Design a protein around this ligand. Structure first.
Ligand code: HEM
Ligand SMILES: [N]
Length: 180
């Protein structure tokens, strides 16, 4: 399922609010009905002079497995949006696999305040699109997203009730990895 082509970052967002601390996905919306496994995710995005680098963590709640990555990209001029390439690393941040130049993901920030954020992610594997992925984030695990971010969800044409809540999945996180 192809990703939406009508996704743009919110104008006027302050980078400092998004590129700080660590983020936990509290709710997510995957539009592809063929998916089966549900994931938990946490990441730490940093930025310097328009260059973005982030440590990502995924935990497969169904198969009880996890994987780590390091994404690197550049900030678009338009807004808080960037397309990054990613390498695969272990829990110690050692490189297990270099980045495949044909793969990428574009992350678009739709809203972000001091406690939460809403982002859109489009992952691509060369030519195949994995489909739209919307994720609500908070700095505190299982915390409640702000009213401001919930409003962003509505404005995005989505219903919070359709999102999957991760606080009930029995998530396992590696706070050591995202800390720092
Ligand atoms: C709860 C939220 C999330 C869900 C449901 C989710 C789901 C997925 C799925 C299904 C895969 C494929 C893994 C497999 O082979 O089985 C995956 C891979 C990946 N996701 Fe996510 N993801 C989440 C959050 C994120 C975030 C926050 C980012 C970006 C910052 C992201 C970036 C990626 C990347 C780069 C890969 C590829 C890793 C690799 O192939 O080594 N994901 N995700
Ligand atoms: N993803």
């Amino acid at each position: 399922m192809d990703c939406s082509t009508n996704i743009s970052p919110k104008q006027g967002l302050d980078k400092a609010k998004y590129f700080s601390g660590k983020w936990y996905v509290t709710h997510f919306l995957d539009k592809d009905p063929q998916v089966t496994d549900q994931y938990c995710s946490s990441f730490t995005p940093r930025e310097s002079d328009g260059t973005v680098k982030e440590a990502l963590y995924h935990y497969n709640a169904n198969k009880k497995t996890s994987f780590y990555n390091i994404g690197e990209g550049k900030l678009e001029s338009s807004g808080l949006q960037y397309t990054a390439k990613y390498k695969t690393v272990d829990k110690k941040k050692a490189v297990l696999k270099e980045a495949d130049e044909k793969n990428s993901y574009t992350l678009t920030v739709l809203e972000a305040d001091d406690s939460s954020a809403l982002v859109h992610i489009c992952l691509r594997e060369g030519s195949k699109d994995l489909g739209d992925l919307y994720t609500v984030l908070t700095h505190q695990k299982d915390a409640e997203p702000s009213a401001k971010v919930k409003s962003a969800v509505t404005q995005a044409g989505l219903q919070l009730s359709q999102f999957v809540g991760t606080k009930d999945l029995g998530c396992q996180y590696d706070d050591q990895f995202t800390s720092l």
